[PDB]
Amino acid sequence: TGRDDTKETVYISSIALLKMLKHGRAGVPMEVMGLMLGEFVDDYTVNVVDVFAMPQSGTGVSVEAVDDVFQAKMMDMLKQTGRDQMVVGWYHSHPGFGCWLSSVDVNTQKSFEQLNSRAVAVVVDPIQSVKGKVVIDAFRLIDTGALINNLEPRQTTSNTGLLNKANIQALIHGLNRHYYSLNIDYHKTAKETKMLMNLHKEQWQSGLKMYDYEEKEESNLAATKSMVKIAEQYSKRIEEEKELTEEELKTRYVGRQDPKKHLSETADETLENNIVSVLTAGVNSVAIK
Amino acid sequence: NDKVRFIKDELRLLQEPGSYVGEVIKIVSDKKVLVKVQPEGKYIVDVAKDI
């Protein structure tokens, strides 16, 4: 053919990620309509520096939801600050569905595919993102004629060759006849890394603070009393346990929410607290005076 | 190690989609069966690879 037609590894920066999630979680229910601004290099690598939410609309997703006034307006002002970038695709929310492109989403996709044939359409579902990669995936049109003649896999070289898809349904139906799917990776620097982890000078502050001793003494008694009560359960358990079948032991004398195990965790927890409580106290006594 | 892999395993399957339950009304000769899902319509749906 005339392209390599190999599905791009999508590196959306950590700055971009934060934007993309925010705009889709806001607009629920609703489909939010944006564009991806980065720079395409190679034949397999897209780097997404920033994204733009173009203004929300009541027509959903269509070609009649692109607004070229609003598109240009964004572009013109990036140039003027010198932060200029070009489209590499577009993104959108499903407010309560999985990740696939509809037929109607394939035509939105198509407008950008004229611009460059490595246009990605990214689907965000933010009611099911409790993790940053989950239920987000990137798709890219394949040539229609590659399908007829069965050259459809050829994304299996220039890549990891692993491909995690999600779901039966619409996904496999559009995968077959329209697009090729590949995982979104997420890329970051070490200046950004320090920014997230750090929590100002009030981070060290928490570690010399002492607390009301009513709550400390109370914490101790609660744990203490708790281990008497499940330790009568423990007595029953190790009185018996002279009978064969492991499963049978777990029904009869317990081994499902095992008393020895539950006691040991709670005992350790309060023991660790009180090692801290005396350390942090003795530190302050000497240190400050 | 076994304890961490299993918790991740519990978590994994919760992220996977739900499951249901019907009762077979009749048998089809297309390598399918006709199931009637208990709050839902009939479906003729392919069968598991182990039966």
Binding site: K133, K188, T193, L196, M197, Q203, G207, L208, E272, V276 | -
Partner: protein, 51 residues
Amino acid sequence: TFLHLPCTIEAEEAEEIGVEHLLRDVRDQAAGGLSIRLTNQLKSLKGLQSK
């Protein structure tokens, strides 16, 4: 004049999800196990002295 105020991070819901995901480090401070807080105690002392 410019008067300093609290400059806190507390984060949005939206933000939290990308932040943890990108994270794959054991964090500067998290205050989880005893190991993290034994480190922390000694870090605090160096902290007090520097101000």
